[PDB]
Each structure stands twice: as C-alpha cells, then as structure tokens.
Amino acid sequence: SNVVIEDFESSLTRSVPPLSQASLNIPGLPPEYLQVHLQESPVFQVPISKAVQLTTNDAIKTTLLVELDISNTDFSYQPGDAFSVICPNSDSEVQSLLQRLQLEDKREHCVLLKIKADTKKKGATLPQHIPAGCSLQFIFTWCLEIRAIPKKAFLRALVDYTSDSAEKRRLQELCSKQGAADYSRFVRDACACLLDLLLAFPSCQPPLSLLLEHLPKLQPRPYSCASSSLFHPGKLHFVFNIVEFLSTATTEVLRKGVCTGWLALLVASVLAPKISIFPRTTNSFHLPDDPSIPIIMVGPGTGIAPFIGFLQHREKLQEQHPDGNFGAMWLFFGCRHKDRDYLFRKELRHFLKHGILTHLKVSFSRDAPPAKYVQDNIQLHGQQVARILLQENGHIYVCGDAKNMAKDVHDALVQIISKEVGVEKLEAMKTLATLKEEKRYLQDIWS
To answer: What is the CATH number of domain 43-87+220-280?
Structure first.
C-alpha cells in the first residue's frame, strides 16, 4: 500500500470545484505588533490521595472520581461549589509543536516580549496571559491554548509565511468568503488545531511572534465539589468523564480533552501527584439555608456530582440532630445502562436506607424493557413535584453537561405546572421564570 487519493476527494489540504476555481475575497492582514526575543539563561497545590473508576470497562464514556487532600491548606468549600484546576498541555503535543517551529532546541530559552516600534496596530499591548521571562517550554505547556481552533484571521496571517503555491492557495481559500463551508467542515467541525494545520501545510513557517499574537490563554477548567467536608474531613472530591473526540491528527484517531486527559494520566498509579486549584469567588448552587425546605435534584450522568455532596452533607446534619425537621430530598438520576454507568449505585442505596434520600427515580436511556430520560420520571411524579415547588417553598436543582437536557427538563416542568394547577402554558412559563428569579430553580450546566 502506497496512499492513493481519487480526483473527487476534498479534505483540509485540497478543494474541488467551485471553490478550487473561485475568485477569493480574503480578509485584511492583521497588523503584527509583538517582538519576541529568545534569551538563553490565591492558588493551592494539593495532592491526589485517591481515584476510583466509577464506570464499567465497556462504558462508552469513562467516569472517574478524584479525591484531593486539602488538609494542608486554608481552602474551604460547601457542597455545590465549583473550583478551577490549572492543567498543562500534553508534553508530546508541546514537543511536536516546538519541533515543527524549529524551536525544540530553544525550549529552555526565556521569552522576552516587547511591542514592535514599527507596528500599525493602534492600542497594542502585551498579552496578559504570557508571563514575561518564562521559558518557551513553560509558556507552551501552561499558558497557551495550543488546542484552539485557528480563527480565519490567524489563517490569513499564515498565508504570508507559506511558500508553496498550492498550500498558500488552500489557506487563502480557508479564510475567504467563498471558503466558509470548507472552513466549517475541515477546520471548525474537525477540531483542527495549529499543530494539525502546520503538519498539513509543511511550507508554512510562521514566526513565534505571530503565534503569540493569536494563541489564546490556556484556561483553567472548573469542576463541581462532589463531597461535603462534614463527611470526608480534609478531602475534596470531584467527578468527571474523560473527554474523547475525533480530530485532524493524522497518526491519532481520538484526542482526549486537555484537563481530563491530563487528570487521567496523573491518577493511573493512584487508581502522590499534585495539582493546583483555586476557588471560584461566587458560588450559588447550594443547599437551602433552612434544612426543613424540601428539594428536588435532577442530575443525569456526571451531573449527579454536586448532589452526592448535598446528600453527604445532609447525612451528617441529620446525625447531629435526629428528630430535626428535615425537608424531603428527591433525586432524578439518568444514565445509559443499568449495568455500565449507574454512578454511585451503592452510595445512593445507603442514602435511601438511612432516610437521607427520600425518593430516587432512575432512568436508563439505552436499556431494553419505562422512563428513558429524567424528564420522563419528573412528569410521572408531576403532582408531587408541583406541590413541593408551589406549596412547600421547595427548591429544584438541575445539573449536567447538556443545555438540551436543561431545556427538556424546563419544558417538562412547564407541562407539569400547567396540568397540575390548571393554568395556561404562558402562566406556567412565567411561574418557572419567577422561581429562577426567587433562586428556587437553580441550574449548573457545564457546556
């Protein structure tokens, strides 16, 4: 086998008619402004003390629970809080990119930044997210989102540093009006990153200054607290799916997410390494101050995470004060398969056995014969749901990755209120809006 490609096959590097033949409207060149010289020369670091795989080996997505030891910090949290994790790029991707830029041998040189004297960019300032005088290695590992999908203006600037006629023409197409569909297909939908682009266009030799003008900040990733300090003193738990997605990489089929791919590598020997975290300033996804108030928790898949924290917190509260007036706690949980991704099955049973969790309703979306999704079970218990919210001052909490799930749960609630109270659909919609304004309908949506 040699690789043989047919005349009709378009791809990142190759267009077909009409684009391959079109006259192009190409964006203006962004004005360069950074001068780079390579000079030869409230965050908490916490250990990972435990990690557990929550899903079976054949689950479509792998879910881990990670425990951090916060005992030697002054960090505190309440169930439902989020915190940020400061994660690096993969060493192999950083090395591959520096090698591609002819800079691997300069990786320990310090990056010194100034504004070019001759720049035509008004208001030019130095990128806040690149710390002055750090090593090239450090900046690519910890400061730049090298995974970012290159914008059309970045592709435009790369045109000028590409010497091969066909390659140059292709980048012109990809950043042009006419090329919008090829861009959306081959760059945006494909999740192409700078490295993928440079490997696919080998004659493109951009300067380091250009990259530093366009690569964005490597953002920390937030995670939800999935424990109570009352239950696991000195510890903080969180729960995540390892993100896997298809990418432009030629010698690689699946890429992992930056933060979850890193966490998964770190914990392989725990399943101690240390990670840096910081708290979010504002958190609002909390249990009611008044423990008598009943609550409804809706958390499909890893959306269950904050509610494990809520239940551990209430178990401890109840132990402190038996005979206390404690509101009901309902959980609507959803997963794909009872035998693969039923997160926390045993712990939930413990909560029910001990009367902390009042009701549990679980849906299995891909099991054979029932409720497929959480909103189906919510509708089956519409009478109780409406009463808790409208007569008992209850709160309802919706957590999870999909905005689709949140809208579907919202629309179920509209139906339930309309049906149970006998009001118009519009009045039910306004009811839920007012519950959100009153902070009794809370959402923690992750994407």
So the answer is: 2.40.30.10
